[PDB]
């Protein structure tokens, strides 16, 4: 169904080659400008060697017109569960003293919990002075000490990567069909470049551009859908904010690694002589993830998930106004001595007139060898090129017309000679 729409002929300034033992080995070196198609149409580009039948195509298909958001500040967070341990020790026994328990460091282990050892799990150590005497289980009248060893751990099997968007880059998923037959799918954003097996592709002009996104944040789930949060991002981990306990990786959240950050004075402690109860008011991210999940209607645009690379995207309601710059890093394009024949047929016609979508045509090509099939009209204004394979195949590209009653006779050629072909159909009005 998808087919080329903007078909232009390459100039002779970047087209050259020579015949060595009856073998047209053309070379391409230089830059070329071509207009990108709309959603559904393609950008065909034929090449003319030394004859007429020797012609290969270079079509670029446009998948969709999304808007990739540039990721800046990102982190990893999730649900956790406090696990506190109590071990009351009498006074004047080991590290139980009136001055060694009140001013206890929040990063040093005691002799009561030294049996665990070194670990990469986040934790903290507190000191609380209880009571003494025989009324609570002691021998001396001095108050005993309570050593608290509370460590955080997660109870979920997944995590979330809450990030923000600082810029919306116009990303276009474009594939490259080489002259031999290999298809390579890549992407182009704003004015980026890639590396292929024949040159370099790049974008010269963007389209639209959503501005103002610093007061919004997105949530990405590994293997699941996306989400959106109507809240500005905060660089400091504070309480009551979506991200009070952050990390840097999924393993640092599912296992609670010590490399993550957290807010000070968050675990509420309730010492009761010999009882310990640590209750934390952690914010569950799944409530916001299930509350504001994409797709979500925001202004005139429609934010949705991605259809390829991992990252937030955006769906627009406009057209496609971009220009593609096709380069040539001295690529070798071979040709045959004589192309094979082929008899084209007619199938159907479905589309519209006067619009960026165009209209696709059904053409039944029945050949034998491998080649192309160039077609022309009666005044040299409509060129149609289609791949020629073995057997009977149905092809056809996107055609543009200004009349709903198209009754123009075409002249298709597979190896040099032309044959008459009449097409028909009814088009509709497309805005």
């Amino acid at each position: 169904d998808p087919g080329c729409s903007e078909l232009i002929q390459a100039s002779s300034r970047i087209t050259t080659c020579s015949t060595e033992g009856v073998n047209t080995k053309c070379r391409l070196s230089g830059t070329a400008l071509i207009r990108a198609g709309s959603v559904g149409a393609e950008a065909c580009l034929m090449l003319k060697g030394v004859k007429e039948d020797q012609t290969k195509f270079l079509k670029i298909k446009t998948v969709s017109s999304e808007l990739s958001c540039r990721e800046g500040q990102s982190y990893w967070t999730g649900s956790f569960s406090p696990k506190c341990l109590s071990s009351r020790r009498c006074h004047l026994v080991g590290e139980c003293h009136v001055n060694r328990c009140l001013s206890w460091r929040d990063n040093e282990t005691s002799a009561e919990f030294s049996f665990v050892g070194e670990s990469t799990t986040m934790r903290e150590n507190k000191c609380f002075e209880q009571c003494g005497g025989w009324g609570c289980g002691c021998f001396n009248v001095n108050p005993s000490c309570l050593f608290v060893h509370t460590y955080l751990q997660s109870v979920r099997k997944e995590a979330l990567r809450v990030f923000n968007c600082i810029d919306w880059v116009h990303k276009l998923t474009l594939e490259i069909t080489d002259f031999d037959g290999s298809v390579s799918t890549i992407d182009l954003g704003a004015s980026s470049s890639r590396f292929t097996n024949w040159g370099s592709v790049s974008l010269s002009l963007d389209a639209e551009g959503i501005s103002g996104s610093n007061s919004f944040s997105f949530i990405e789930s590994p293997g699941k859908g996306y989400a959106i949060v109507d809240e500005p991002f905060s660089e400091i981990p504070r309480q009551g904010f979506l991200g009070e306990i952050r990390c840097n990786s999924e393993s640092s959240v599912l296992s609670a690694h010590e490399s993550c950050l957290r807010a000070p004075n968050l675990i509420s402690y309730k010492p009761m002589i010999d009882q310990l109860e640590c209750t934390t008011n952690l914010i569950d991210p799944f409530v916001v993830f299930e509350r504001g999940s994409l797709p979500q209607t925001r202004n005139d645009k429609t934010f949705a998930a991605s259809k390829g690379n991992r990252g937030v995207q955006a769906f627009s309601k406009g057209s496609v106004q971009a220009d593609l710059t096709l380069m040539f890093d001295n690529f070798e394009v071979d040709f045959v001595g004589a192309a094979v024949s082929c008899d084209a047929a007619f199938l159907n016609l479905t589309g519209c007139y006067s619009c960026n979508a165009g209209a696709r045509v059904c053409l039944s090509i029945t050949s034998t060898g491998t080649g192309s099939l160039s077609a022309h009209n009666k005044d040299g204004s409509l060129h149609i090129v289609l791949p020629s394979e073995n057997g009977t195949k149905d092809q056809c590209q996107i055609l543009h017309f200004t009349v709903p009653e198209v009754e123009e006779e075409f002249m298709y050629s597979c190896d040099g000679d032309e044959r008459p072909l009449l097409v028909k159909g009814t088009l509709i009005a497309i805005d």
Binding site: S184, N197, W198, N330, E332
Partner: protein, 301 residues
């Protein structure tokens, strides 16, 4: 890098036909001895690619393990009259080698085993392009490249070198440059697949994984220092074997858990076995990937 520097799995033979004068210390290759065709490979600041991947076989070790075939002749004479086959393939390579050397093996175009040989007692020079008359002469060869041999079953005959804008790179010739030609000293890596030629690539992308082959597992016996032991004698799950062996979850997940009746303590290698390369977008396992230093002749007209 890799901790196993001198320990070579399997045979570990590093001797070529015509220079069999170092088999007393280089057959096999252990922590002791003095093999001239292996000591220069572990030098710091010289061949870092060999230091990154050291658990796999080398070039000669791959030749003796029925992996890399031999050329014709395998060791050409770099002193014989009426020319020699090892000349054009050597003048196009810009490599350096110390003195007191007689042979210098490298890789040809067909992916076989092509080397040179100097009759005694003729030593090489700084570039190794020509020999000359004569401390002590080394009884071996000098690796002119930085590749390692490995066993793979991935076909890649259609993945020929597609270096655009380059007339003749390394040793192979893409076409006959009749107009302009730009000669420069540039470094370009190479890769050899199964039933293919010396394919050159631009960028190099490594990949380290594991499998179930005995080469990805090592073991040592307990006796009254480090003592190596043949890991291939470990029986499989429901099969047969020779000497028992046990280990952790990685070693026990591949073989059979014996423990009480085991004679050695098997362990897992530090990431070795299958080394794939990123070519044509997909991932394929080469046979002798390297990173040599030759002369690339680019085009201009």
């Amino acid at each position: 890098e890799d901790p196993h520097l001198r320990n070579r799995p399997g045979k570990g033979h590093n001797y070529i036909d015509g220079m069999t004068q170092e088999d007393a210390t280089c057959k096999p290759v252990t922590y002791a001895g003095a093999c001239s065709s292996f000591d220069v490979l572990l030098e710091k600041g010289k061949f870092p690619l060999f230091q990154s991947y050291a658990h796999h076989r080398t070039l000669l070790e791959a030749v003796h393990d029925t992996i890399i075939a031999k050329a014709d002749p395998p060791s050409c004479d770099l002193q014989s009259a009426h020319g020699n086959p090892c000349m054009k393939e050597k003048l196009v390579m810009k490599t350096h080698c110390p003195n007191d050397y007689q042979s210098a093996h490298y890789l040809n175009n067909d992916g076989k085993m092509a080397s040179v040989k100097c009759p005694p007692k003729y030593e090489l020079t700084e570039d190794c392009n020509f020999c000359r008359q004569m401390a002590s002469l080394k009884k071996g060869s000098y690796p002119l490249q930085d590749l390692f041999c490995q066993s793979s079953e991935d076909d890649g005959s259609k993945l020929k070198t597609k270096m655009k804008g380059v007339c003749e790179v390394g040793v192979q010739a893409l076409k006959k440059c009749d107009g302009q030609l730009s000669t420069a000293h540039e470094v370009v890596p190479f890769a050899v697949f199964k039933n293919s030629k010396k394919v050159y690539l631009d960028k190099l992308d490594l990949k380290t994984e594991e499998n179930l082959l005995p080469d990805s597992f090592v073991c040592f016996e307990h006796k009254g220092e480090l003592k190596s032991f043949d890991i291939s004698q470990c029986p499989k799950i429901g099969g047969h074997g020779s000497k028992k062996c046990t280990g952790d979850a990685a070693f026990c997940s591949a073989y059979e858990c014996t423990a009480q009746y085991a004679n050695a303590y098997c362990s897992h290698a530090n990431g070795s076995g299958i080394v794939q390369i990123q070519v044509s977008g997909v991932w394929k396992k080469p046979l002798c990937v390297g990173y040599e230093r030759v002369v690339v002749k680019r085009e201009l007209s």
